[PDB]
Amino acid sequence: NIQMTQSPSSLSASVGDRVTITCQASQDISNYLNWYQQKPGKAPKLLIYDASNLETGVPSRFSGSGSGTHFTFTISRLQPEDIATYYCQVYETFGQGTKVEIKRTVAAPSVFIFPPSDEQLKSGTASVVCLLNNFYPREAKVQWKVDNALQSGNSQESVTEQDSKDSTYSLSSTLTLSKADYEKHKVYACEVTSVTKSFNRGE
Amino acid sequence: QVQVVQSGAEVKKPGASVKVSCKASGYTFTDHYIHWVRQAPGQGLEWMGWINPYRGGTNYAQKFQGRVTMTRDTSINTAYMELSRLRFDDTAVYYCARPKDCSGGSCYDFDYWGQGTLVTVSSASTKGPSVFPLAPSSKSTSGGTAALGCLVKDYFPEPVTVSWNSGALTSGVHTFPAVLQSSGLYSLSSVVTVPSSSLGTQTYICNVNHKPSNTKVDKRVEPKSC
């Protein structure tokens, strides 16, 4: 029956400036629109109810306005912990969502490398982990060199969501090899673009 | 305090059914409706239906009509959402929520949400995780900062949660999202950066919880001597 049009789909803004999101209802819904904040891995949290009222406990920097068909959600000064996806909703219809992100200054990653544990080696498998810690922006290329030979198809990457405090990202690359293959080679290098972190298996 | 607590995540085979519980406390269970909203991975929120705990009346969205059943037991303040004939795309986090007080007859201001319940529609079986240390060493030390962690490998289904020192260690912690390996099992790493001068003095224990297999692992990560 009712269709919500949320805009923008995503935005990126600096700490302290004003974040603005709009929702348009297909029909007059009076002031019966709510706004939610969903942090990653979390349930949605009600922020604004009845389009204007601050839900109990919600910080005062969040506000909403509008009546009829046009509505607005605003964060007066964006905080580092406000990284989330925000939804508007009336009755049974949820808006498409707005992922707000923080623009911050460039930070180089801290690169660490972990050889496979002896405990895992007893199981017949080797996982070697390369860690990129607290970097911005999100773009990063990670590749594995085994005895200075390029690897492909045997590594998986995982990137955390933007940190709630320093607004940085972290990345992990996991090269998975059999126990026999791991003991068949010596030099294990992680190349991040460009810096290199490597170890020798026997050391 | 007003709390709404759901049952744990589980994996159900395609064509089977799942029933998620939703226990409310801290308020009169019959004074508020109980709604259900689901969220597929990386998608938006989808309203499923509501139930009135007083008399048991329900109202389902037509998408789930004939396939969903919402019941309640007032004697234990618990609502239930049963979804039958599970499809592969029924894989989602299922939430229950209650609305605020209102007098218009349609209260939809969801002020309290359950923690959610990840239902994975798959034929793969439940497997507990293996936890291995990510020991700090010279290769894990940059400047005056050292990195350590735990590797949680070969578990199914999601999720696993990781804490450090039973929650007392949160600063610098990064628990990466799980990756789906080619074997069909999940795997993730949880890491934390600490001063290198604390290695061998401070104790670092990772607490890995995998409720689907009812398995908890606490492992002390010890420094390497290289």
Numbering used by the authors:
A (entry chain L): 1 to 91, 96 to 197, 202 to 211
B (entry chain H): 1 to 52, 52A, 53 to 82, 82A, 82B, 82C, 83 to 100, 100A, ...
Text taken from the publication that reported this structure:
Moreover, VRC01-class bnAbs have very distinct and targetable genetic and structural characteristics. Specifically, they have restricted immunoglobulin heavy chain variable region alleles (IGHV1–2*02 or *04) and a short five amino acid light chain complementarity determining region 3 (CDRL3). Finally, GT1.1-induced VRC01-class mAbs are structurally extremely similar to VRC01-class bnAbs. A subset of isolated VRC01-class monoclonal antibodies neutralized wild-type pseudoviruses and was structurally extremely similar to bnAb VRC01.
